Design an enzyme around this catalytic site. Sequence first.
Site, PDB file in Angstrom:
ATOM      1  CG  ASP A 199     -30.612 -61.653  52.456  1.00 59.22           C
ATOM      2  OD1 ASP A 199     -29.925 -60.822  53.097  1.00 59.22           O
ATOM      3  OD2 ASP A 199     -31.714 -62.119  52.843  1.00 59.22           O
TER       4      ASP A 199
ATOM      5  CG  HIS B  22     -19.860 -52.038  48.309  1.00 53.46           C
ATOM      6  ND1 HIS B  22     -18.774 -51.252  47.981  1.00 53.46           N
ATOM      7  CD2 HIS B  22     -19.523 -53.305  47.967  1.00 53.46           C
ATOM      8  CE1 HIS B  22     -17.814 -52.014  47.488  1.00 53.46           C
ATOM      9  NE2 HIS B  22     -18.249 -53.261  47.461  1.00 53.46           N
TER      10      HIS B  22
ATOM     11  CD  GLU C  26     -22.615 -55.242  49.427  1.00 49.03           C
ATOM     12  OE1 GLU C  26     -23.318 -54.429  50.069  1.00 49.03           O
ATOM     13  OE2 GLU C  26     -22.385 -55.092  48.205  1.00 49.03           O
TER      14      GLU C  26
ATOM     15  CG  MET D  38     -21.515 -56.836  40.172  1.00 45.77           C
ATOM     16  SD  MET D  38     -20.219 -56.575  41.438  1.00 45.77           S
ATOM     17  CE  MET D  38     -20.724 -57.819  42.645  1.00 45.77           C
TER      18      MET D  38
ATOM     19  NE  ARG E  41     -21.179 -54.153  33.184  1.00 44.24           N
ATOM     20  CZ  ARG E  41     -20.302 -54.607  32.291  1.00 44.24           C
ATOM     21  NH1 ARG E  41     -20.382 -55.853  31.832  1.00 44.24           N
ATOM     22  NH2 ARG E  41     -19.336 -53.797  31.866  1.00 44.24           N
ATOM     23  CE1 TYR E  42     -19.153 -56.306  37.668  1.00 44.75           C
ATOM     24  CE2 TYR E  42     -18.059 -56.883  35.607  1.00 44.75           C
ATOM     25  CZ  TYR E  42     -18.373 -55.960  36.570  1.00 44.75           C
ATOM     26  OH  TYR E  42     -17.935 -54.686  36.417  1.00 44.75           O
TER      27      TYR E  42
ATOM     28  CG  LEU F  10     -15.323 -52.514  38.511  1.00 46.37           C
ATOM     29  CD1 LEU F  10     -16.695 -51.817  38.375  1.00 46.37           C
ATOM     30  CD2 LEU F  10     -15.477 -54.023  38.663  1.00 46.37           C
TER      31      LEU F  10
ATOM     32  CD  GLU G 125     -18.348 -56.475  54.230  1.00 49.68           C
ATOM     33  OE1 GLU G 125     -18.861 -56.446  53.051  1.00 49.68           O
ATOM     34  OE2 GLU G 125     -17.661 -55.551  54.729  1.00 49.68           O
TER      35      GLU G 125
ATOM     36  CG  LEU H  42     -16.249 -58.571  39.232  1.00 51.69           C
ATOM     37  CD1 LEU H  42     -16.284 -59.646  40.286  1.00 51.69           C
ATOM     38  CD2 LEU H  42     -16.495 -57.221  39.852  1.00 51.69           C
TER      39      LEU H  42
HETATM   40  C1  LIG Z   1      -7.706 -57.452  46.372  1.00 50.65           C
HETATM   41  C2  LIG Z   1      -7.142 -57.581  44.957  1.00 50.65           C
HETATM   42  C3  LIG Z   1      -5.684 -57.995  45.103  1.00 50.65           C
HETATM   43  C4  LIG Z   1      -5.535 -59.410  45.655  1.00 50.65           C
HETATM   44  C5  LIG Z   1      -4.177 -59.957  45.281  1.00 50.65           C
HETATM   45  O1  LIG Z   1      -3.165 -59.403  45.805  1.00 50.65           O
HETATM   46  O2  LIG Z   1      -4.147 -60.924  44.468  1.00 50.65           O
HETATM   47  C6  LIG Z   1      -7.101 -56.327  44.068  1.00 50.65           C
HETATM   48  C7  LIG Z   1      -6.976 -56.661  42.571  1.00 50.65           C
HETATM   49  C8  LIG Z   1      -7.277 -55.339  41.848  1.00 50.65           C
HETATM   50  C9  LIG Z   1      -7.593 -54.348  42.979  1.00 50.65           C
HETATM   51  C10 LIG Z   1      -8.403 -53.076  42.660  1.00 50.65           C
HETATM   52  C11 LIG Z   1      -7.785 -52.209  41.549  1.00 50.65           C
HETATM   53  O3  LIG Z   1      -6.447 -51.864  41.921  1.00 50.65           O
HETATM   54  C12 LIG Z   1      -8.620 -50.945  41.225  1.00 50.65           C
HETATM   55  C13 LIG Z   1      -9.181 -50.166  42.433  1.00 50.65           C
HETATM   56  C14 LIG Z   1      -8.150 -49.067  42.748  1.00 50.65           C
HETATM   57  C15 LIG Z   1      -8.375 -48.288  44.044  1.00 50.65           C
HETATM   58  O4  LIG Z   1      -7.181 -47.560  44.319  1.00 50.65           O
HETATM   59  C16 LIG Z   1      -8.632 -49.192  45.244  1.00 50.65           C
HETATM   60  C17 LIG Z   1      -9.738 -50.198  44.939  1.00 50.65           C
HETATM   61  C18 LIG Z   1      -9.597 -51.038  43.660  1.00 50.65           C
HETATM   62  C19 LIG Z   1     -11.010 -51.597  43.418  1.00 50.65           C
HETATM   63  C20 LIG Z   1      -8.633 -52.216  43.922  1.00 50.65           C
HETATM   64  C21 LIG Z   1      -9.024 -53.035  45.175  1.00 50.65           C
HETATM   65  C22 LIG Z   1      -8.222 -54.325  45.406  1.00 50.65           C
HETATM   66  O5  LIG Z   1      -6.906 -53.971  45.867  1.00 50.65           O
HETATM   67  C23 LIG Z   1      -8.156 -55.192  44.137  1.00 50.65           C
HETATM   68  C24 LIG Z   1      -9.586 -55.721  43.862  1.00 50.65           C
HETATM   69  C1  LIG Z   2     -16.355 -50.521  44.257  1.00 48.80           C
HETATM   70  C2  LIG Z   2     -15.353 -51.457  43.584  1.00 48.80           C
HETATM   71  C3  LIG Z   2     -15.019 -50.997  42.187  1.00 48.80           C
HETATM   72  C4  LIG Z   2     -13.989 -49.882  42.180  1.00 48.80           C
HETATM   73  C5  LIG Z   2     -14.734 -48.725  41.601  1.00 48.80           C
HETATM   74  O1  LIG Z   2     -15.518 -48.114  42.361  1.00 48.80           O
HETATM   75  O2  LIG Z   2     -14.558 -48.467  40.391  1.00 48.80           O
HETATM   76  C6  LIG Z   2     -15.932 -52.874  43.593  1.00 48.80           C
HETATM   77  C7  LIG Z   2     -16.905 -53.301  42.459  1.00 48.80           C
HETATM   78  C8  LIG Z   2     -16.899 -54.842  42.519  1.00 48.80           C
HETATM   79  C9  LIG Z   2     -15.893 -55.185  43.647  1.00 48.80           C
HETATM   80  C10 LIG Z   2     -15.220 -56.559  43.689  1.00 48.80           C
HETATM   81  C11 LIG Z   2     -16.251 -57.703  43.666  1.00 48.80           C
HETATM   82  O3  LIG Z   2     -17.235 -57.532  44.705  1.00 48.80           O
HETATM   83  C12 LIG Z   2     -15.616 -59.103  43.802  1.00 48.80           C
HETATM   84  C13 LIG Z   2     -14.571 -59.237  44.926  1.00 48.80           C
HETATM   85  C14 LIG Z   2     -15.364 -59.457  46.209  1.00 48.80           C
HETATM   86  C15 LIG Z   2     -14.486 -59.533  47.447  1.00 48.80           C
HETATM   87  O4  LIG Z   2     -15.360 -59.554  48.555  1.00 48.80           O
HETATM   88  C16 LIG Z   2     -13.599 -58.303  47.573  1.00 48.80           C
HETATM   89  C17 LIG Z   2     -12.763 -58.198  46.298  1.00 48.80           C
HETATM   90  C18 LIG Z   2     -13.589 -58.059  45.015  1.00 48.80           C
HETATM   91  C19 LIG Z   2     -12.580 -58.188  43.857  1.00 48.80           C
HETATM   92  C20 LIG Z   2     -14.367 -56.698  44.963  1.00 48.80           C
HETATM   93  C21 LIG Z   2     -13.511 -55.464  45.311  1.00 48.80           C
HETATM   94  C22 LIG Z   2     -14.095 -54.071  45.021  1.00 48.80           C
HETATM   95  O5  LIG Z   2     -14.850 -53.623  46.159  1.00 48.80           O
HETATM   96  C23 LIG Z   2     -14.910 -54.011  43.724  1.00 48.80           C
HETATM   97  C24 LIG Z   2     -13.930 -53.968  42.534  1.00 48.80           C
END
Ligand SMILES: C[C@H](CCC(=O)O)[C@H]1CC[C@H]2[C@@H]3[C@H](O)C[C@@H]4C[C@H](O)CC[C@]4(C)[C@H]3C[C@H](O)[C@]12C
Ligand SMILES: C[C@H](CCC(=O)O)[C@H]1CC[C@H]2[C@@H]3[C@H](O)C[C@@H]4C[C@H](O)CC[C@]4(C)[C@H]3C[C@H](O)[C@]12C
EC number: 4.98.1.1
Lengths: 356, 355
Positions: free
Chosen positions: B272, B195, B275, B12, B100-101, B34, B279, B28
């Site tokens: 490292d 994770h 995470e 990533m 990836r990003y 995603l 975290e 992302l």
């Molecule tokens: C935390 C952030 C919202 C912050 C904000 O309110 O601006 C949002 C933006 C898009 C969100 C993601 C998207 O809705 C897609 C994923 C949907 C799953 O139901 C939960 C995780 C999921 C990966 C979400 C996690 C988190 O709530 C995200 C990453």
């Molecule tokens: C696991 C989940 C993707 C949802 C999925 O499984 O498809 C992961 C992949 C990359 C992640 C995102 C990236 O790590 C970048 C952001 C990092 C912050 O610490 C949390 C929000 C944040 C926006 C993440 C939320 C979420 O856990 C994501 C969206």
Amino acid sequence: RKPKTGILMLNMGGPETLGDVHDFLLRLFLDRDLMTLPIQNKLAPFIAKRLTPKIQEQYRRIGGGSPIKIWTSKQGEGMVKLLDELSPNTAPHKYYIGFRYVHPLTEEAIEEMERDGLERAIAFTQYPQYSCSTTGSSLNAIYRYYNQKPTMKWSTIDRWPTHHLLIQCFADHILKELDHFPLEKRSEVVILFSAHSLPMSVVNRGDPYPQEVSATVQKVMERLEYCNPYRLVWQSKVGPMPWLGPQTDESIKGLCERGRKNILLVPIAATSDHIETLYELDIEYSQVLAKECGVENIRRAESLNGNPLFSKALADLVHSHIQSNELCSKQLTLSCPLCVNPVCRETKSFFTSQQL
Amino acid sequence: RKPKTGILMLNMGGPETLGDVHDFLLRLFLDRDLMTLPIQNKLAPFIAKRLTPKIQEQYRRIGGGSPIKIWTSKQGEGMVKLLDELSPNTAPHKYYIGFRYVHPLTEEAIEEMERDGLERAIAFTQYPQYSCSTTGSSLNAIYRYYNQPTMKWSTIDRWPTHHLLIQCFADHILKELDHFPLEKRSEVVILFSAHSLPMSVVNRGDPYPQEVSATVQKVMERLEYCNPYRLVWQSKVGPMPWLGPQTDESIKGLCERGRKNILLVPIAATSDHIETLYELDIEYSQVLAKECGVENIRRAESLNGNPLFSKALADLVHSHIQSNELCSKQLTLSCPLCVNPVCRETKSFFTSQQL
Ligand SMILES: C[C@H](CCC(=O)O)[C@H]1CC[C@H]2[C@@H]3[C@H](O)C[C@@H]4C[C@H](O)CC[C@]4(C)[C@H]3C[C@H](O)[C@]12C
Ligand SMILES: C[C@H](CCC(=O)O)[C@H]1CC[C@H]2[C@@H]3[C@H](O)C[C@@H]4C[C@H](O)CC[C@]4(C)[C@H]3C[C@H](O)[C@]12C
Ligand SMILES: C[C@H](CCC(=O)O)[C@H]1CC[C@H]2[C@@H]3[C@H](O)C[C@@H]4C[C@H](O)CC[C@]4(C)[C@H]3C[C@H](O)[C@]12C
Ligand SMILES: C[C@H](CCC(=O)O)[C@H]1CC[C@H]2[C@@H]3[C@H](O)C[C@@H]4C[C@H](O)CC[C@]4(C)[C@H]3C[C@H](O)[C@]12C
Ligand SMILES: C[C@H](CCC(=O)O)[C@H]1CC[C@H]2[C@@H]3[C@H](O)C[C@@H]4C[C@H](O)CC[C@]4(C)[C@H]3C[C@H](O)[C@]12C
Ligand SMILES: C[C@H](CCC(=O)O)[C@H]1CC[C@H]2[C@@H]3[C@H](O)C[C@@H]4C[C@H](O)CC[C@]4(C)[C@H]3C[C@H](O)[C@]12C
Ligand code: FES
Ligand code: FES
């Protein structure tokens, strides 16, 4: 002459006849290790009565009841015979069945073991992979019985998710079933490992079971040298709450709709035939669901059942446990990080605290 | 001699500096593998600008950026040295980073590999345990690059139980256990931390939890069950259901029940990154743990520059070369409930390669 070492084989059990279903349901609705209900003493008899006809019908569809006791007896018989030759200093060995919710109940077998004046008792769970709602619930009953002092020395074989001869039995039965598919379809077969699911609330508090079930799967797949692709999936979900999936029924259907119409089902978390295999997979999913999906070949690996190699695994496990002088696994000495059941702690110390 | 064999190392990534955070979040939030959002092209930039300060702040708490590139490079350099010696008939080997990003993006690396006129390209994921959202997304990008090769492609798409991977983790666990007071050592509980995934991903058929579970088992066998353990999951965000006990809650639940000596083990990453450094080390080991009553909390060292780890890397590529495999048997099975049309195209890209 007299038996020296008792092996207590622990399982949930299942009703031997249709008439046994009601009481099987009742004991289980009364178990607070399993569930806490409002006005539970009132609702448990009531729930057991409303579920009885539906569950009776399921056992009718499989010939009238569960083969669990017969398989357990035969496996215990074979284990004992081996153990008398392998371990002559602990011999004569004797196996007891302790089912959680049907006759020979855990409490009845413990009573019989005490009557027989054994030097040694071993709590040997027949669930290779540890769940607190499964093996833990069985060990809780043993502690509770004595709380409600032993005159014999206790230990437990509380898990064995990767025992090498368990692994071989599963690999052997899989290879056997693969050979029953048409040759031309063999490489195309997808393997679905299937285990009873758990509620997410159970998963999320720390239950060891999903990670251990995952380990059994990897070991079987290594032994098989990754000959077919696979997924580990979960069956037996009920109610509207979330459980661990992907669900076995949904996966069969999902896969079929995506062009993967040749499927081998593997009951990975059980060692004998019961309702889950003979009704749920064989009838509910393989016959009904799968017909409706356009499946070409679905089959199910044979349960370990009377495999003489599985008896050898049992004896090897007991023999190794005796030589090691262990009282329980290292894993048992750790409770779920979010355990809220006061008895888990007492049950663990019951075993870690044994004289010897 | 011109490089003959390229190894593309897939991860990533994470922002190298504070200024890199915005574009990291933007890429992302634009990725539909995603995430699908309403008016995504309008919202992605907007969510990215809103999250930027808070995420920059996390990187500032760790010194100003992710070390991912540095560790990936050292690991890459070591692997290649070993491979030229181990496999002369495929030599000049050369490694490329495809993040990836963040820069070097997957697409930039592939363009450089093509330009170098390599005979073969190996897509080598740095996630030992396959998720469709990590490795799968990386392999989708390669397929989509050509959809938008002059070399023969293949992938090493998972390696959750490589014997030398397992040894590295076991080695690092044991060395960390030595750092507890001797009288607390047998009492140490090990929390394997990976994770997490949303349940909607798990329930779809994602292979990751069972593979992560397999790695945990192997390391624990190698350690001969010296300590008791659980596999727990970190990095949940938002209000939806996600898998498995949370790492943070487990530390706290454990302290409350008299288990105040805890070894945290990052089991699903090889270097490292945010995470571990933020975290685990700051958010949980410092703040939460103070709040709780912990006696000792430690974290096993990431594999980072362990020379046994670059040996694992070389061994994995060497055996892949000798085996002639294009991808694992596992990759030929898509999730039972996959609703993403690319996964199947990406699989055929690999299964169908010339050679
Ligand atoms: C935390 C952030 C919202 C912050 C904000 O309110 O601006 C949002 C933006 C898009 C969100 C993601 C998207 O809705 C897609 C994923 C949907 C799953 O139901 C939960 C995780 C999921 C990966 C979400 C996690 C988190 O709530 C995200 C990453
Ligand atoms: C696991 C989940 C993707 C949802 C999925 O499984 O498809 C992961 C992949 C990359 C992640 C995102 C990236 O790590 C970048 C952001 C990092 C912050 O610490 C949390 C929000 C944040 C926006 C993440 C939320 C979420 O856990 C994501 C969206
Ligand atoms: C999910 C639960 C495990 C206990 C827990 O972890 O909370 C299991 C253990 C025994 C199970 C039950 C027993 O198999 C008996 C019943 C069997 C029926 O097929 C469904 C309901 C039925 C009542 C089951 C519901 C549920 O799946 C139970 C209660
Ligand atoms: C609320 C409680 C579960 C406790 C919990 O999980 O927190 C549920 C589980 C099973 C429920 C009962 C069973 O479903 C049987 C009955 C079914 C009827 O539709 C409602 C009343 C009825 C008598 C239920 C009342 C109550 O909602 C119970 C007792
Ligand atoms: C299926 C049956 C209700 C049928 C009825 O109304 O008679 C109910 C009664 C008690 C229920 C169980 C209890 O509510 C306790 C558990 C609560 C968890 O949230 C789900 C699983 C759980 C183990 C339940 C599964 C299922 O919904 C059961 C087994
Ligand atoms: C609808 C979508 C979740 C996608 C899904 O259901 O899987 C969510 C995730 C993140 C959300 C957005 C981001 O959190 C940023 C904004 C936050 C505001 O509180 C609401 C609007 C706002 C612009 C959100 C709209 C919508 O609720 C989004 C886009
Ligand atoms: S619920 Fe697992 S130890 Fe109490
Ligand atoms: S989501 Fe797993 S194969 Fe498409």
